[PDB]
Design a binder for this molecule. Sequence first.
Ligand SMILES: *[C@@H]1O[C@H](CO)[C@@H](O[C@@H]2O[C@H](CO)[C@@H](O)[C@H](O)[C@H]2NC(C)=O)[C@H](O)[C@H]1NC(C)=O
Lengths: 42, 49, 42
Amino acid sequence: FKIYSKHTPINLVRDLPQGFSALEPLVDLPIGINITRFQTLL
Amino acid sequence: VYAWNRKRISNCVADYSVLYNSASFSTFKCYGVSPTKLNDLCFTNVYAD
Amino acid sequence: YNYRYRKPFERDISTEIYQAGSKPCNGVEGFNCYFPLQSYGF
Ligand SMILES: *[C@@H]1O[C@H](CO)[C@@H](O[C@@H]2O[C@H](CO)[C@@H](O)[C@H](O)[C@H]2NC(C)=O)[C@H](O)[C@H]1NC(C)=O
Protein backbone atom coordinates (compact mmCIF):
# COMPACT_ATOMS: atom_id res chain seq x y z
CA PHE A 1 0.00 0.00 0.00
CA LYS A 2 1.39 3.37 -1.18
CA ILE A 3 0.36 6.98 -0.69
CA TYR A 4 1.27 9.65 -3.14
CA SER A 5 0.18 13.04 -1.76
CA LYS A 6 0.54 16.85 -1.84
CA HIS A 7 -0.67 19.66 0.50
CA THR A 8 -1.17 23.45 0.07
CA PRO A 9 -3.32 26.41 1.15
CA ILE A 10 -5.74 27.36 -1.71
CA ASN A 11 -7.90 30.22 -3.04
CA LEU A 12 -10.98 28.13 -4.10
CA VAL A 13 -12.21 25.49 -1.61
CA ARG A 14 -15.55 23.78 -2.61
CA ASP A 15 -14.67 22.72 -6.23
CA LEU A 16 -11.44 21.48 -7.87
CA PRO A 17 -8.64 23.96 -8.79
CA GLN A 18 -7.26 24.28 -12.34
CA GLY A 19 -3.51 24.43 -13.29
CA PHE A 20 -0.76 21.78 -12.93
CA SER A 21 0.55 19.82 -9.86
CA ALA A 22 1.91 16.35 -8.90
CA LEU A 23 1.73 14.05 -5.84
CA GLU A 24 4.80 12.59 -4.15
CA PRO A 25 5.37 9.07 -2.63
CA LEU A 26 4.95 10.00 1.06
CA VAL A 27 4.15 6.34 2.03
CA ASP A 28 4.91 2.73 1.15
CA LEU A 29 3.65 -0.18 3.32
CA PRO A 30 4.79 -3.67 2.04
CA ILE A 31 2.49 -5.28 4.66
CA GLY A 32 0.58 -7.67 2.30
CA ILE A 33 -3.06 -6.87 3.34
CA ASN A 34 -5.41 -7.72 0.43
CA ILE A 35 -7.53 -4.48 0.52
CA THR A 36 -10.99 -4.39 -1.23
CA ARG A 37 -12.70 -1.52 0.77
CA PHE A 38 -12.02 1.86 2.35
CA GLN A 39 -13.73 4.61 4.44
CA THR A 40 -13.16 8.31 5.44
CA LEU A 41 -12.70 9.27 9.16
CA LEU A 42 -13.25 12.42 11.24
CA VAL B 1 -0.69 -23.48 5.23
CA TYR B 2 -3.79 -21.18 5.25
CA ALA B 3 -2.54 -18.95 8.15
CA TRP B 4 1.03 -19.11 6.68
CA ASN B 5 3.49 -16.79 8.47
CA ARG B 6 4.23 -13.80 6.11
CA LYS B 7 7.36 -12.98 8.21
CA ARG B 8 8.69 -9.69 6.67
CA ILE B 9 12.40 -10.19 7.53
CA SER B 10 13.61 -6.59 7.40
CA ASN B 11 16.23 -4.01 8.53
CA CYS B 12 18.99 -6.69 8.71
CA VAL B 13 22.07 -8.58 7.32
CA ALA B 14 22.73 -12.35 6.98
CA ASP B 15 24.84 -15.06 5.36
CA TYR B 16 22.77 -17.14 2.89
CA SER B 17 25.71 -19.33 1.71
CA VAL B 18 25.41 -21.10 5.11
CA LEU B 19 21.68 -21.80 4.39
CA TYR B 20 22.64 -23.14 0.92
CA ASN B 21 25.36 -25.40 2.45
CA SER B 22 23.07 -26.49 5.37
CA ALA B 23 22.01 -30.17 5.72
CA SER B 24 18.86 -29.00 7.69
CA PHE B 25 16.61 -29.00 4.56
CA SER B 26 15.14 -32.02 2.67
CA THR B 27 14.77 -29.54 -0.25
CA PHE B 28 16.31 -26.10 -1.00
CA LYS B 29 16.00 -24.32 -4.40
CA CYS B 30 16.23 -20.76 -5.84
CA TYR B 31 14.49 -19.50 -8.99
CA GLY B 32 15.23 -15.84 -9.99
CA VAL B 33 18.83 -16.37 -8.69
CA SER B 34 21.14 -19.44 -8.65
CA PRO B 35 21.78 -20.61 -5.04
CA THR B 36 25.60 -20.00 -4.93
CA LYS B 37 25.09 -16.23 -5.57
CA LEU B 38 22.91 -15.41 -2.52
CA ASN B 39 25.57 -13.67 -0.31
CA ASP B 40 25.76 -10.92 -3.05
CA LEU B 41 22.01 -10.04 -2.81
CA CYS B 42 20.21 -7.06 -1.26
CA PHE B 43 16.42 -6.55 -0.90
CA THR B 44 13.76 -4.22 0.58
CA ASN B 45 12.40 -7.23 2.58
CA VAL B 46 12.36 -11.02 2.53
CA TYR B 47 8.86 -12.38 3.25
CA ALA B 48 9.94 -15.69 4.88
CA ASP B 49 6.51 -17.31 4.19
CA TYR C 1 -4.96 -32.30 13.62
CA ASN C 2 -3.38 -28.77 13.89
CA TYR C 3 -2.01 -28.78 10.27
CA ARG C 4 -4.70 -28.25 7.54
CA TYR C 5 -5.42 -26.15 4.36
CA ARG C 6 -7.99 -23.34 3.81
CA LYS C 7 -3.99 -18.07 -4.33
CA PRO C 8 -0.52 -16.43 -5.04
CA PHE C 9 0.42 -15.29 -1.47
CA GLU C 10 -3.34 -15.25 -0.65
CA ARG C 11 -3.94 -14.75 3.10
CA ASP C 12 -6.74 -13.70 5.49
CA ILE C 13 -8.07 -14.81 8.94
CA SER C 14 -10.85 -16.69 7.03
CA THR C 15 -11.75 -19.99 5.24
CA GLU C 16 -14.70 -21.46 3.20
CA ILE C 17 -15.95 -24.79 1.62
CA TYR C 18 -15.22 -26.02 -1.95
CA GLN C 19 -18.32 -26.54 -4.13
CA ALA C 20 -17.48 -30.15 -5.14
CA GLY C 21 -21.06 -30.22 -6.60
CA SER C 22 -23.91 -27.78 -7.50
CA LYS C 23 -24.88 -27.60 -3.75
CA PRO C 24 -24.58 -24.43 -1.61
CA CYS C 25 -22.71 -26.46 1.07
CA ASN C 26 -22.99 -23.94 4.07
CA GLY C 27 -19.52 -25.18 5.32
CA VAL C 28 -21.28 -28.56 6.07
CA GLU C 29 -19.67 -31.90 5.10
CA GLY C 30 -21.29 -34.32 2.59
CA PHE C 31 -21.10 -36.19 -0.74
CA ASN C 32 -19.98 -33.51 -3.25
CA CYS C 33 -19.74 -31.11 -0.23
CA TYR C 34 -16.31 -32.44 0.84
CA PHE C 35 -14.85 -30.48 3.80
CA PRO C 36 -11.87 -28.21 2.81
CA LEU C 37 -9.83 -28.50 6.07
CA GLN C 38 -8.87 -32.18 5.54
CA SER C 39 -6.91 -33.78 8.45
CA TYR C 40 -3.23 -34.79 7.88
CA GLY C 41 -1.58 -38.17 8.72
CA PHE C 42 1.24 -36.36 10.65
C1 LIG D 1 -7.02 -11.22 -2.78
O1 LIG D 1 -8.36 -11.58 -2.32
C2 LIG D 1 -9.23 -12.29 -3.29
C3 LIG D 1 -10.59 -12.53 -2.63
O2 LIG D 1 -11.06 -11.28 -2.09
C4 LIG D 1 -8.52 -13.57 -3.74
O3 LIG D 1 -9.40 -14.34 -4.63
C5 LIG D 1 -9.22 -15.81 -4.67
O4 LIG D 1 -8.44 -16.17 -5.87
C6 LIG D 1 -8.32 -17.62 -6.19
C7 LIG D 1 -7.50 -17.77 -7.48
O5 LIG D 1 -6.17 -17.28 -7.26
C8 LIG D 1 -9.75 -18.18 -6.33
O6 LIG D 1 -9.72 -19.59 -6.65
C9 LIG D 1 -10.51 -18.00 -5.01
O7 LIG D 1 -11.83 -18.58 -5.16
C10 LIG D 1 -10.61 -16.50 -4.66
N1 LIG D 1 -11.23 -16.33 -3.35
C11 LIG D 1 -12.33 -15.61 -3.14
C12 LIG D 1 -12.81 -15.54 -1.68
O8 LIG D 1 -12.91 -15.01 -4.05
C13 LIG D 1 -7.22 -13.16 -4.44
O9 LIG D 1 -6.56 -14.32 -5.01
C14 LIG D 1 -6.30 -12.43 -3.44
N2 LIG D 1 -5.06 -12.01 -4.10
C15 LIG D 1 -3.96 -12.75 -4.11
C16 LIG D 1 -2.78 -12.21 -4.94
O10 LIG D 1 -3.87 -13.79 -3.47
